[PDB]
Design a protein around this ligand. Structure first.
Ligand SMILES: CN(C[C@H]1CCOC1)c1ncncc1Cl
Lengths: 39, 156
């Protein structure tokens, strides 16, 4: 059996750590919900 | 049980100790998570029970207690926040500019942030605090890094 525990509010945090890049990827989505890269 | 709006951890005691298998959003009395987190199983919230209402393996989404409520969309231009809830760690907001998943059926936003598998279901928000989608279904690119889609459902 699975259970849920509150972890916090959903709010935008000003001065949050800004990281990560913005890649443009050609992808395919299968019937099982799995994404894959197209080349 | 607890019905307050917000982000929640999805735990299980079926494995060693108490293990976090994912995360979800409680909004308007409806719990939202990714399908691969729960496999559509019932959830417990204290003494209460949450039953699946809608779900789709291909979209990789599931709602409990009612229909999917989250309908905000990424504007395609602005930075967003991943409200990451990692296993055994406090919830933290990470700001990023999303990339794009170019598919045969249209483009989807994508956040290039790598977190443990138990972080799946963590909401991605816009500047207004609105949930524009959930983190946890994506791909692994050339260098080994993870890129999640900004996965959003449809509000009927
Ligand atoms: C560690 N992974 C990839 C899984 C998926 C199948 O192979 C390993 C994540 N899964 C969900 N949310 C974030 C991450 Cl990074």
């Amino acid at each position: 059996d699975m259970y849920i525990e509150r972890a916090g509010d959903i709010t935008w945090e000003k001065d949050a750590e800004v990281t990560g890049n913005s890649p443009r990827l050609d992808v395919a989505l299968d019937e099982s919900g799995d994404f894959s890269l197209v080349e | 049980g607890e019905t307050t709006d917000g982000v929640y951890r999805v735990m299980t005691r079926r494995l060693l100790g108490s293990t976090q298998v994912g995360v979800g959003v409680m909004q308007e009395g409806v719990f939202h998570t990714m399908w691969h987190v729960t496999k559509g199983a019932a959830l417990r919230s204290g003494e209460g029970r949450l039953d699946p209402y809608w779900g789709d393996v291909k979209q990789d989404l599931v709602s409990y207690c009612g229909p999917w409520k989250l309908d905000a969309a990424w504007d395609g231009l602005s930075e967003v926040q991943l409200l990451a809830v990692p296993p055994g760690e406090r919830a933290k907001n990470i700001q990023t500019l999303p990339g794009i998943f170019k598919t045969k059926d249209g483009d989807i936003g994508a956040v290039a942030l790598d977190y443990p598998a138990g972080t799946s279901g963590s909401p991605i928000l816009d500047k207004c605090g609105r949930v524009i989608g959930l983190y946890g279904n994506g791909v692994v690119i050339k260098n080994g890094s993870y890129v999640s889609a900004i996965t959003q459902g449809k509000r009927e």
